[PDB]
Design a protein around this ligand. Sequence first.
Ligand SMILES: [Cl-]
Ligand SMILES: [Cl-]
Length: 162
Amino acid sequence: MNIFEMLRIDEGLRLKIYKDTEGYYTIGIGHLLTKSPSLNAAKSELDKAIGRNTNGVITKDEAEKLFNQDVDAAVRGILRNAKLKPVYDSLDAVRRAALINMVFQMGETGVAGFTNSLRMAQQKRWDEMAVNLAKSRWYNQTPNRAKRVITTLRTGTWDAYK
Ligand SMILES: [Cl-]
Ligand SMILES: [Cl-]
């Protein structure tokens, strides 16, 4: 198991523009296109992202390309985040994957807000951190996914994904 496989599981793969759990225009493997209610705005964003006139449909390779780019950006944004970096550095390899997933789904700013859970993570207070993470909108909105990530983060193993 690794980050790519982990997110491929949580995000799925879709070759056609679709709406995510929050109603936004997405495509590929969890690639947000826009928050605007406009399909056309979405189509515009897609062609610009791909570099061609897509007509709302992309190939697997294309999806996978956005995916690489997106994981890369998540890692890099963690590493440059003054609140995130220190947490990341303190974690083992599995737990780091979990921090990446959360950043991928909710953005750097979003995660940086989980101040209290971040302090716990850094203190290696596993069970308390998990409890706290669960008291969130993120958990109430996407509980199964959230559950998988929290377990990962709590335990440092891939059990929730096997
Ligand atoms: Cl892009
Ligand atoms: Cl879910």
